[PDB]
C-alpha cells in the first residue's frame, strides 16, 4: 500500500531536482570573454600576467588572464578557458571528473551500520580508535602528542566480514572513500602498475583526508597469467612502487590505508612491518554464541515462526561465518518459495542446513580421509 | 547521414565533417547510405551525387 507515497515522493524529488541584466560589470566581464570561449591546457606559469598554454594539436602561446578569477586556481596540468581573438586565458574550467573518481570515489554510505556485525566488539573498537578517532575526535592526540596508527590488515577465512567491515567503515564516514580489488594491478602492457599506483594515490591525496581500502592484495604475489607482459620482473616493480608509495616521504597525509587478505603467509615482510601498517587485526571465526546474533540480524526483517532452535544450528558444523548463516537464510527462502509459504518452518532449515553444509564444505572424495 | 529534407551531414575529404543542406536538383533516392557527392568551395553545400567511381 506504500507504493503511492513512494511513486509520488520519487516524482516530486525528480521534478524539484529539475527546478534549476541586473549586473552590468558581470556582463562587461562576459563581453571580455569571447563568444567562442575555447579550451586549452597549461604547461608553465610565468608571473608577468601571462603564461604558456597548449592547444589541442600543439600550438602554444603567451596569453594573459582575465583577472577576476584567480590564478592561484591554476596549476600545471589543468584545463583552462582560452579566447579566439588573442587566445587569452579566460577563466577556470571545472576539472575532468575522470572515471577514476566515478568508479572509485564511492559517494554512498552503503548498507547497515555496526549493528550488522557478528562476533565483533573488539575489532570494531580497534578500527574505531585507529581510523574514526583519528578522523572524528583527534583531540586526544593533542592531549598526549602521539602519532595515530597507520595501516590496518583484515585477515582470516573467506566469508568472515572483510567485505562487511569495509562497508561498515564506509557507512559511518565523513571522508572520501576509495576501493580497489587487488587483482586489478596487472595489465596487458609493460609498466602499467606504477602508473596506477601514482595516479590512484595522487587522486587520493588531492581532494581531502580520505580512506583507501584495497582487498585481496595477496592476488599479486601468488598469481600468474598468460595475460602478462614481462612478469615477475614487473610484479616486483609494481610491489616496489607501492612499497615506496606507502612508506615514502613528504608527509603522506591523513589517508588511512586499510588492507584485507584471506591468507597471510605469502606476503612481503617488508609490507607488514610498522611504519607502513601499525594495526594488524586478527579475524578468527569468533564464537558459537554470536552465531545467534547473525541469525537474529539476518532474520530481523523476515517473517518466521518459532519452530527452530539455533542450538540445532550450533551443533551442526565446526566453522562458523556470516557466509554460513546468510546462505542458510537465502536457501530457506528458496525452500519457502519452493513450497509457496511464509513464516519459515523447521524443514526448510533442515534441508537448507544439509544442502549448504554439503555445498560447500566437505573435502575430498572418499577416502580421504576418513 | 540525412537529417530530413533540405538538410544532411556529409564528411568531406578534408577529414572533417559538416552540417550542410542539400539541393532539390538531387533525386532523393541517390543517397542510399553512401554516395560520392559533390560540394561547393565557399559555402561547402552539397551540389550533386556522382556515379560509382573512386
Amino acid at each position: 500500500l506504500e507504493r503511492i507515497k513512494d511513486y509520488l515522493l520519487m516524482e516530486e524529488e525528480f521534478i524539484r531536482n529539475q527546478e534549476q541584466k541586473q549586473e552590468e560589470e558581470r556582463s562587461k566581464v562576459d563581453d571580455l570573454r569571447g563568444t567562442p570561449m575555447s579550451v586549452g591546457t597549461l604547461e608553465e606559469i610565468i608571473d608577468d600576467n601571462h603564461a604558456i598554454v597548449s592547444t589541442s594539436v600543439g600550438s602554444e602561446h603567451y596569453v594573459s588572464i582575465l583577472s577576476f578569477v584567480d590564478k592561484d586556481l591554476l596549476e600545471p596540468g589543468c584545463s583552462v578557458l582560452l579566447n579566439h581573438k588573442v587566445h587569452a586565458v579566460i577563466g577556470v574550467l571545472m576539472d575532468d571528473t575522470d572515471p577514476l573518481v566515478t568508479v572509485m570515489k564511492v559517494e554512498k554510505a552503503p548498507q547497515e551500520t555496526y549493528a550488522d556485525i557478528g562476533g565483533l566488539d573488539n575489532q570494531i573498537q580497534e578500527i574505531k580508535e585507529s581510523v574514526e578517532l583519528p578522523l572524528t575526535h583527534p583531540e586526544y592526540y593533542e592531549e598526549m602528542g602521539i602519532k595515530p596508527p597507520k595501516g590496518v590488515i583484515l585477515y582470516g577465512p573467506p566469508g568472515t566480514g572483510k567485505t562487511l567491515l569495509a562497508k561498515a567503515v564506509a557507512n559511518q564516514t565523513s571522508a572520501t572513500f576509495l576501493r580497489v580489488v587487488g587483482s586489478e594491478l596487472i595489465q596487458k602492457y609493460l609498466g602499467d602498475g606504477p602508473k596506477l599506483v601514482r595516479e590512484l594515490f595522487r587522486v587520493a591525496e588531492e581532494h581531502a583526508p580520505s580512506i583507501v581500502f584495497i582487498d585481496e592484495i595477496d592476488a599479486i604475489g601468488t598469481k600468474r597469467y598468460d595475460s602478462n607482459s614481462g612478469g615477475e620482473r614487473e610484479i616486483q616493480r609494481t610491489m616496489l612502487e607501492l612499497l615506496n608509495q606507502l612508506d615514502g616521504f613528504d608527509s603522506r597525509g591523513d589517508v588511512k590505508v586499510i588492507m584485507a587478505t584471506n591468507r597471510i603467509e605469502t606476503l612481503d615482510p617488508a609490507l607488514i612491518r610498522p611504519g607502513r601498517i601499525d594495526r594488524k587485526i586478527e579475524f578468527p571465526l569468533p564464537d558459537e554464541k554470536t552465531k545467534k546474533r547473525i541469525f537474529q540480524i539476518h532474520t530481523s526483517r523476515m517473517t518466521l515462526a518459532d519452530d527452530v532452535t539455533l542450538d540445532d544450528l550450533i551443533m551442526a558444523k565446526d566453522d562458523l561465518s556470516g557466509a554460513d548463516i546468510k546462505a542458510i537464510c537465502t536457501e530457506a527462502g528458496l525452500m519457502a518459495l519452493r513450497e509457496r509459504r511464509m513464516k519459515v518452518t523447521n524443514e526448510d532449515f533442515k534441508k537448507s542446513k544439509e544442502n549448504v553444509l554439503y555445498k560447500k564444505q566437505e573435502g575430498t572424495p572418499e577416502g580421504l580421509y576418513l | 547521414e540525412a537529417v530530413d529534407q533540405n538538410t544532411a551531414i556529409v564528411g568531406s575529404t578534408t577529414g572533417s565533417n559538416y552540417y550542410v543542406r542539400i539541393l532539390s536538383t538531387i533525386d532523393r533516392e541517390l543517397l542510399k547510405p553512401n554516395a560520392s557527392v559533390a560540394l561547393h568551395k565557399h559555402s561547402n553545400a552539397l551540389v550533386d551525387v556522382l556515379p560509382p567511381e573512386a
Partner: protein, 98 residues
C-alpha cells in the same frame, strides 16, 4: 527559385555535447578538435542538452543551430562486434529442465 541563396549559405559544424553549464552556456567537441564553450541561440532548447549528442553548430560565430538526431548506438556497436546466435525457445528442444 529566386530564394535559393538560402542554399548558397555557409556550412556548419557537427560536434559533441558533453553537458551544459551555467548562464545558458554549453560545450562542444567538434569533429577532430578540442573543447569549445559555445553560445546558445533563441530557437533551441537547453532542456534538450543530452550527454553525448550531436547538434548543428554554426561555423562563423559557433552558435547552436539545431539538434542532430541518431547519436551513437554504442551497445549496438558492441553487439555487432559479437553477432551471437539470436535465439528463442523453439530451438533448444530435447531438454527443458535447465
Amino acid at each position: 527559385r529566386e530564394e535559393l541563396q538560402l542554399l548558397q549559405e555557409q556550412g556548419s559544424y557537427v560536434g559533441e555535447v558533453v553537458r551544459a553549464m551555467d548562464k545558458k552556456k554549453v560545450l562542444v567537441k567538434v569533429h577532430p578538435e578540442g573543447k569549445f564553450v559555445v553560445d546558445v541561440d533563441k530557437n533551441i532548447d537547453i532542456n534538450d542538452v543530452t550527454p553525448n549528442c550531436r547538434v548543428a553548430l554554426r561555423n562563423d560565430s559557433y552558435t547552436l543551430h539545431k539538434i542532430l538526431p541518431n547519436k551513437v548506438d554504442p551497445l549496438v556497436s558492441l553487439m555487432m562486434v559479437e553477432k551471437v546466435p539470436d535465439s528463442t525457445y523453439e530451438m533448444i528442444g530435447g531438454l527443458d529442465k535447465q
